Design a protein around this motif. Structure first.
Motif, PDB file in Angstrom:
ATOM      1  N   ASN A  93       0.814  -1.466  -0.134  1.00  0.00           N
ATOM      2  CA  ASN A  93      -0.132   0.052  -0.062  1.00  0.00           C
ATOM      3  C   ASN A  93       0.713   0.842  -0.070  1.00  0.00           C
ATOM      4  N   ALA A  94       2.109   1.400   0.567  1.00  0.00           N
ATOM      5  CA  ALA A  94       3.029   2.828   1.328  1.00  0.00           C
ATOM      6  C   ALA A  94       3.528   3.033  -0.537  1.00  0.00           C
ATOM      7  N   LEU A  95       3.942   2.017  -1.301  1.00  0.00           N
ATOM      8  CA  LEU A  95       4.496   1.528  -2.120  1.00  0.00           C
ATOM      9  C   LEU A  95       3.373   2.364  -3.445  1.00  0.00           C
ATOM     10  N   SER A  96       2.346   1.856  -3.677  1.00  0.00           N
ATOM     11  CA  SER A  96       1.091   2.483  -4.069  1.00  0.00           C
ATOM     12  C   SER A  96       0.780   3.759  -4.385  1.00  0.00           C
ATOM     13  N   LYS A  97       1.231   4.108  -3.878  1.00  0.00           N
ATOM     14  CA  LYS A  97       0.512   5.603  -3.605  1.00  0.00           C
ATOM     15  C   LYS A  97       2.372   6.005  -4.875  1.00  0.00           C
ATOM     16  N   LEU A  98       2.717   5.706  -4.668  1.00  0.00           N
ATOM     17  CA  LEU A  98       3.790   6.092  -6.253  1.00  0.00           C
ATOM     18  C   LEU A  98       3.906   5.129  -6.951  1.00  0.00           C
ATOM     19  N   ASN A  99       2.882   3.915  -7.128  1.00  0.00           N
ATOM     20  CA  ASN A  99       2.524   3.796  -8.729  1.00  0.00           C
ATOM     21  C   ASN A  99       0.795   2.778  -8.236  1.00  0.00           C
ATOM     22  N   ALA A 100       0.061   3.172  -8.761  1.00  0.00           N
ATOM     23  CA  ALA A 100      -1.048   2.605  -8.094  1.00  0.00           C
ATOM     24  C   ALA A 100      -1.397   0.813  -8.369  1.00  0.00           C
ATOM     25  N   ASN A 101      -1.635   0.922  -9.898  1.00  0.00           N
ATOM     26  CA  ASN A 101      -1.822  -0.422 -10.632  1.00  0.00           C
ATOM     27  C   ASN A 101      -0.488  -0.815 -10.320  1.00  0.00           C
ATOM     28  N   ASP A 102       1.428  -0.432 -10.157  1.00  0.00           N
ATOM     29  CA  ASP A 102       2.189  -1.475 -10.120  1.00  0.00           C
ATOM     30  C   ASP A 102       3.167  -1.900  -9.349  1.00  0.00           C
ATOM     31  N   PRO A 103       2.043  -1.518  -7.579  1.00  0.00           N
ATOM     32  CA  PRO A 103       2.958  -1.044  -6.600  1.00  0.00           C
ATOM     33  C   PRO A 103       4.172  -1.796  -5.925  1.00  0.00           C
ATOM     34  N   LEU A 104       4.524  -3.081  -6.988  1.00  0.00           N
ATOM     35  CA  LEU A 104       5.977  -3.369  -6.848  1.00  0.00           C
ATOM     36  C   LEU A 104       7.433  -2.446  -7.223  1.00  0.00           C
ATOM     37  N   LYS A 105       6.483  -2.083  -8.810  1.00  0.00           N
ATOM     38  CA  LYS A 105       7.340  -1.447  -9.164  1.00  0.00           C
ATOM     39  C   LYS A 105       8.119  -0.339  -9.014  1.00  0.00           C
ATOM     40  N   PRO A 106       7.713   0.788  -8.050  1.00  0.00           N
ATOM     41  CA  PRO A 106       8.646   1.491  -8.019  1.00  0.00           C
ATOM     42  C   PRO A 106      10.542   0.770  -6.981  1.00  0.00           C
ATOM     43  N   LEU A 107       9.541   0.182  -6.378  1.00  0.00           N
ATOM     44  CA  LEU A 107      10.994  -0.377  -5.271  1.00  0.00           C
ATOM     45  C   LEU A 107      11.629  -1.262  -6.951  1.00  0.00           C
ATOM     46  N   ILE A 108      10.986  -2.248  -7.593  1.00  0.00           N
ATOM     47  CA  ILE A 108      11.815  -2.816  -8.628  1.00  0.00           C
ATOM     48  C   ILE A 108      13.020  -1.455  -9.463  1.00  0.00           C
ATOM     49  N   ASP A 109      12.355   0.054  -9.562  1.00  0.00           N
ATOM     50  CA  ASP A 109      12.746   0.968 -10.249  1.00  0.00           C
ATOM     51  C   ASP A 109      14.315   1.342  -9.450  1.00  0.00           C
ATOM     52  N   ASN A 110      14.677   1.102  -8.276  1.00  0.00           N
ATOM     53  CA  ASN A 110      15.116   2.088  -7.437  1.00  0.00           C
ATOM     54  C   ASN A 110      15.715   0.951  -7.139  1.00  0.00           C
ATOM     55  N   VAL A 111      15.446  -0.239  -7.282  1.00  0.00           N
ATOM     56  CA  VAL A 111      17.055  -1.815  -7.259  1.00  0.00           C
ATOM     57  C   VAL A 111      17.418  -1.104  -8.048  1.00  0.00           C
ATOM     58  N   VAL A 112      16.964  -0.918  -9.790  1.00  0.00           N
ATOM     59  CA  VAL A 112      17.717  -0.868 -10.924  1.00  0.00           C
ATOM     60  C   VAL A 112      18.747  -0.137 -11.075  1.00  0.00           C
ATOM     61  N   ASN A 113      18.180   1.515 -10.731  1.00  0.00           N
ATOM     62  CA  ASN A 113      19.365   2.670 -10.812  1.00  0.00           C
ATOM     63  C   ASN A 113      19.634   2.113  -9.657  1.00  0.00           C
ATOM     64  N   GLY A 114      19.671   1.743  -8.176  1.00  0.00           N
ATOM     65  CA  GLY A 114      21.114   1.390  -7.813  1.00  0.00           C
ATOM     66  C   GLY A 114      21.195   2.645  -6.364  1.00  0.00           C
ATOM     67  N   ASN A 115      19.333   3.154  -6.415  1.00  0.00           N
ATOM     68  CA  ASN A 115      18.405   3.858  -4.997  1.00  0.00           C
ATOM     69  C   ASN A 115      18.746   2.712  -4.256  1.00  0.00           C
ATOM     70  N   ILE A 116      18.192   1.330  -4.200  1.00  0.00           N
ATOM     71  CA  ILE A 116      18.172   0.403  -3.218  1.00  0.00           C
ATOM     72  C   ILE A 116      19.071  -1.076  -3.660  1.00  0.00           C
ATOM     73  N   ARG A 117      20.137  -0.908  -2.845  1.00  0.00           N
ATOM     74  CA  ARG A 117      20.901  -1.725  -3.952  1.00  0.00           C
ATOM     75  C   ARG A 117      20.431  -3.263  -3.561  1.00  0.00           C
ATOM     76  N   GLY A 118      19.780  -3.735  -2.263  1.00  0.00           N
ATOM     77  CA  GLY A 118      18.899  -4.593  -2.508  1.00  0.00           C
ATOM     78  C   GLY A 118      18.328  -4.911  -1.290  1.00  0.00           C
ATOM     79  N   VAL A 119      18.067  -6.355  -0.795  1.00  0.00           N
ATOM     80  CA  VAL A 119      17.011  -6.302   0.495  1.00  0.00           C
ATOM     81  C   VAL A 119      17.562  -6.685   1.770  1.00  0.00           C
ATOM     82  N   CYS A 120      17.742  -6.652   3.029  1.00  0.00           N
ATOM     83  CA  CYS A 120      18.486  -7.533   3.683  1.00  0.00           C
ATOM     84  C   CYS A 120      17.617  -7.695   5.338  1.00  0.00           C
TER      85      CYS A 120
END
Ligand code: SF4
Ligand code: SF4
Ligand code: FES
Ligand code: FES
Ligand SMILES: [Fe+3]
Ligand SMILES: [Fe+3]
Lengths: 634, 634
Positions: free
Chosen positions: B412-439
């Motif tokens: 739901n929090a991610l959906s505020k950045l992309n309502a119909n593809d909520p996981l995409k903003p997280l993936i986008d930021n992994v791809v662009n390096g803003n998020i290196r990964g998840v621990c």
């Protein structure tokens, strides 16, 4: 001095051969382990979390308590509980496998299996409440197998393989204490949960859980016997032999070893089909022989001779004549896989969850049972061929064994003296003193005890005092290998009253001679047969089991399964001797519960006694106290 | 130097008080245990039968092998397997209890319980294949509870709380290796059987069984989360506080401690009803606070402040202000029962299979939940009265905690950045390096490690390298108590890329500020929520979990439950750090399987590393290797 290691002369002979050949044995590995850890011996060690290992000094100064605060009471009780759960897991895993075998059989999925004992099937169905009138046998058997499987989990009834096999008065005592299992695997898991870190930490609560899980183990034993009898036939009296001299240099010698006989019963029948194939390889035939309880199972049903038992199992291979050792699971020393390279034995595993590095595995499946058996026997034949020309050393030592005393067979034998009240002649002779009481010898050998010494020392004293002795597992193995199942030894071993009864029964069964000194009631799950007999006597008398002059002795106990059996023997109301120390002495409060205050819960109690002459006296005193409680002379 | 014992200043303050008052703590009991047994530390001890205890010298001369022939490989693997089974028994026993609670609720048997999250109920029913259209909610919930219970035993489907929660491609890899559990309690029992004496004796076979039983543990975790969310509500973001300063001298302080919140969720609501009764006793009110995971559960759902966590749990009592400690099961140091006499705390047990000698027991029953809660709170009120006039020492130390990040809330929090593809903003930021990964930080504190030191050292390095950090259990406890769940600390702790993402999400959620540095995903069973998130990402990307830049760290592991979780994290495909030594180093072959060759089976692997700076580097390297495998810069 091989006499310190085993009282079996055939074993002593093989110990000498292993020594000159440089082959390490269980006794050598024990010597290498001395002195053993005193924390573990006393139960005062815990490894239930990664803050450990924790220990408590039996006496002296710190450490006095586990890191999390667990007392000696808690640590000892938790370790014991896990041992009970592991024993329950083994007997009940065996039973569960047989339930699946029966289901496969009657669904048309494995035609090598079948309903061999229709009478047993119908009786079990009646005991469980499953309707039989109008129903096909295959449907009755499906319902029995479904009921067996259902007892592994919670449902709207408790475990029926407890509640339907003990008298109502006993079930009532157990229920009042919360001891009736809800499901077999349910209780196993609950033990593992409650004994994990930061959970149950009250010795009485923990041990009540253990008693309940021991009844889950009893259910697994009884279920295993029931299902094996349906599938393979209920034992009746049979005559055979035991000890290493049953191996034959000129035959393909194939040992069946483990506990679940699902494949090894088939190997027995297929081996006879392959007699000409064995002859073409230069053998006289295929000589199937038993080790441990898979051996007990085929001995009881088919008179297959027993080669050896637990602690001495390696010695069969040392002869040089053991062409194959066919393994299922439980009580198999994994050393067999390395010894096999030294001795030329092909060791073959068959169960998915019991493999041994270095042993060939055959993926046994009920649907392929005959083809698996032929593949295995062909490896054995090939192995026999490879030993053409090699001398072997089979000790020329064997005993005569009369066995096959299922509870049904015992009742039938007694019925020859009283057709419509078969238990009455036994009771009459308890009352008149010809039979002082009943002792069940159960469980394993243990390398700490010179092999068989406790079983034979205790049995000899009890028999001279007119105790009716029954035996299962390695207790039966010990006794058979020392002549206690040969009726020719009744005069030497038995008191006059017992001799008179064994003779009267035998003569009424047409034998011109007595029953044997000790009645072999079968494998370890077949301790359930002794429960059936004792429950039948309790019901005939209108008293509970804890009033009967019946005791048990796990005189040389080893396996977690034997701890479980001893624990349910106590729980059903029996004075229960154990002849090795279980890991309890580090807590006086736990020891006092298990040897004294449990009497006030279940009527049974442990007798921990390592000296066998003393153990015999304590068992006699327990029997005699029960006689006196019934108003009988003693 | 209390800093060697805990990095938590409130804990250090209470350690000084306990020392001057002569109250022994977990740290004192650890000191008294040193030096610990090196056989147990390395795994080279076996007590699986009464021929033991057996041990193997890590190096040198005999003993080299167990008495029965068991090698170091077998002994180590068997001990590990039993630890996995015990962890599975705890998480799944929790889940099983909640399944019975739900069934009672919808059958009209316990009106204090209800379907609070109807959306979750319907989604779970859809995931399992249970029909919802046209059906009453109470009937859908009965079918869900029945399906939960059915996963404990064999049936015509495998464990659905494995097969329906991982992507098909992962289920296929696991099935190909025989790793899908047949039934939760079935696998627990099979482990106990196969590890008993004379059964499985092949390290690879044993460890495959262990991986399968770890998936039974995963099923129990996921089932527990699912059922608790139905009954009590799915967490959403909440703001609260942590550490001992959340205790209040003028209130009745009641800690809820354990894992299963079935009663403690009710205590939270009833405590507010009793505010005037507490006022009549001179208190301001009833101040419910959390310890361990029962605390996590009520923190996540209701914002109840967390007092403390595992290793430091005794320190809450040392304040002198803890009027009651309400226990369910798991991770409760039994020392609490004796410390309570020194501190004036009333310790109350509530679950039948988890009692502590010296603690008062309340026989909790769902049907009586409100009346049980009032009886318990009245004991607490009476205890508060008894400390009228007595000074207390509550350290004035607490942190702000933002929590409640269920997977639904994260989506739901991610959906505020992309309502119909909520996981995409997280993936986008992994791809662009803003998020290196998840621990994922999971599992306990351990007295061997200065409390929280590994969690905070590793987390700090990962956050500076732009890793998205999520946490559960005592990992979450460690991080919350050191400020890692306070958004005011984002600038200090987070790399610029991570800060940018946490800020973007927070600003889109109306916060005028970022999400916290670490996302609290809940209790130990709620490690399943991290699985849901990672599986959802895998499915969105069309790749398996072992290709994702996601790792786990059980940085201060203690409980058998934590060994189970680490083992299923490996099994589902994750590089999994453990920061304490599990009892494996006595076998190089087993260590090599668990840290290297399992990669070829499941894609995951253990990273055993006691130095936290080094562990951080190894976790970063694991993340970066996954980035490179996806073709991403790193
Ligand atoms: S459970 Fe307690 S006694 Fe056992 S190892 Fe862990 S800290 Fe030590
Ligand atoms: S199972 Fe083997 S290694 Fe373990 S205690 Fe028994 S003899 Fe020793
Ligand atoms: S200290 Fe030897 S058994 Fe643990
Ligand atoms: S020898 Fe110490 S853990 Fe067994
Ligand atoms: Fe046996
Ligand atoms: Fe937890």
């Amino acid at each position: 001095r091989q006499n310190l290691k085993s009282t079996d002369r055939a074993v002593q002979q093989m110990l000498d051969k292993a020594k000159r050949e440089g082959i390490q044995t269980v006794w050598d590995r024990y010597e290498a382990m001395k002195p053993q850890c005193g924390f573990g011996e006393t139960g005062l060690c815990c490894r239930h979390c990664l803050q450990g290992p924790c220990r408590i000094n039996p006496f002296g100064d710190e450490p006095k308590v586990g890191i999390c605060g667990a007392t000696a009471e808690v640590i000892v009780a938790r370790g014991l509980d896990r041992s009970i759960a592991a024993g329950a897991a083994g007997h009940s895993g065996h039973a569960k496998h047989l339930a699946h075998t029966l289901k496969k059989a009657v669904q048309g999925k494995a035609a090598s299996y079948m309903i061999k004992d229709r009478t047993k099937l119908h009786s079990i169905a009646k005991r469980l409440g499953i309707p039989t009138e109008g129903q096909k046998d295959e449907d009755i058997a499906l319902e029995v197998a479904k009921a067996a499987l259902a007892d592994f989990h919670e449902k709207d009834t408790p475990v029926l393989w407890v509640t339907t096999v003990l008298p109502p008065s006993r079930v009532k005592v157990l229920s009042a204490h919360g001891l009736i299992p809800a499901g077999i695997d349910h209780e196993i898991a609950e033990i593992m949960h409650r004994t994990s870190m930061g959970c149950d930490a009250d010795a009485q609560n923990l041990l009540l859980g253990g008693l309940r899980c021991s009844l889950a183990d009893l259910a697994g034993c009884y279920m295993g016997t029931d299902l094996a009898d349906i599938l393979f036939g209920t034992p009746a009296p049979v005559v055979t032999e035991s000890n290493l001299g049953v191996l034959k240099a000129d035959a393909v010698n194939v040992a069946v070893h483990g506990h679940n006989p699902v494949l090894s019963d088939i190997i027995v029948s297929v081996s006879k089909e392959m007699e000409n194939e064995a002859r073409a390889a230069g053998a006289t035939g295929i000589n199937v022989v038993g080790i441990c309880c898979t051996g007990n199972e085929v001995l009881m049903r088919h008179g297959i001779p027993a080669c050896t038992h637990s602690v001495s199992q390696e010695m069969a291979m040392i002869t040089g004549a053991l062409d194959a050792m066919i393994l299922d699971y439980q009580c198999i020393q994994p050393s067999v896989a390395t010894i096999a390279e030294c001795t030329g034995t092909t060791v073959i595993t068959t169960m998915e969850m019991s493999k041994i590095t270095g042993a060939t595995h055959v993926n046994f499946a009920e649907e392929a049972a005959v083809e698996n058996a032929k593949q295995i026997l062909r490896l054995a034949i090939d192995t026999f061929k490879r030993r053409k020309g090699k001398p072997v050393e089979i000790p020329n030592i064997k005993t005569k064994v009369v066995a096959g005393f299922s509870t049904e067979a015992i009742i039938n034998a007694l019925s020859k003296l009283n057709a419509n009240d078969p238990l009455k002649p036994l009771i009459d002779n308890v009352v008149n003193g010809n039979i002082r009481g009943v002792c069940l010898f159960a469980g394993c050998n243990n390398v700490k005890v010179p092999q068989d010494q406790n079983f034979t020392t205790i049995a000899r004293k009890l028999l001279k005092q007119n105790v009716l002795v029954v035996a299962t597992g390695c207790g039966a193995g010990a006794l058979m290998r020392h002549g206690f199942m040969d009726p020719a030894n009744v005069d030497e071993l038995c008191g006059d009253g017992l001799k008179a009864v064994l003779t009267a029964i035998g003569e009424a069964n047409g034998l011109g001679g007595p029953l044997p000194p000790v009645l072999h009631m079968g494998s370890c799950v077949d301790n359930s047969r002794a429960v059936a007999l004792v429950a039948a006597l309790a019901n005939r008398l209108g008293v509970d089991l804890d009033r009967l002059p019946v005791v048990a002795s796990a005189a040389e106990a080893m396996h977690e399964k034997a701890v479980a059996i001893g624990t349910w023997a106590v729980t059903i109301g029996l004075p229960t001797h154990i002849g090795v120390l279980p890991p309890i002495t580090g807590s006086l409060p736990v020891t006092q519960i298990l040897t004294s205050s449990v009497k006030d819960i279940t009527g049974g109690y442990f007798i921990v006694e390592l000296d066998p002459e003393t153990a015999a006296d304590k068992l006699l005193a327990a029997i005699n106290e029960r006689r006196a409680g019934l108003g009988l002379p003693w």
